[PDB]
Amino acid sequence: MTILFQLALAALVILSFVMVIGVPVAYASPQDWDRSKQLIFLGSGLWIALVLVVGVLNFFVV
Amino acid sequence: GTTGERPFSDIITSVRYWVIHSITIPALFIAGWLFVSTGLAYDVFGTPRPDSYYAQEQRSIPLVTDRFEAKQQVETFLEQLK
């Protein structure tokens, strides 16, 4: 499924770009530590998922 | 001490400074750009465009070889490109 791989891959890019900015901002603002220690948590697992997803799909397109 | 002028650190952080220079700096840049893109700088300074170094079939440089007939040699060379 071509467009489904390119969706999964840009999902990954977008989520990385969000995580690139928000993980260090979240970490150095303690006022909202617990506010966010689940957002990076869920980001991380989401991120890992897409890598695995983009990794398996690779074989049905490349 | 201080010779009395306004600290530079103070001016470049002031909003008045960037209000004025948000227009003036790009304005000068765009003028310089236009100086070249209009082709004006070739003609003010006598600098060849890429088509006017040589006549089409000549392979010799328009070297000025006389001191008081010098302005005249350059004018002859340029007409020989037409």
């Binding site: - | 002028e5 306004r6 236009l34 100086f35």
Partner: protein, 34 residues
């Protein structure tokens, strides 16, 4: 209570404004084709 137009003002403007003009010129040159 500072002046704005000083001798220094003239100094930094006699260099600065020609410099920006010249740069815009040179920028434009990178798009000249033979």
């Amino acid at each position: 209570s500072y002046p704005i137009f000083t001798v220094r003002w003239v100094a930094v403007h006699t260099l600065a404004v020609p410099t920006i003009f010249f740069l815009g010129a040179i920028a434009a040159m990178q798009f000249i084709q033979r």
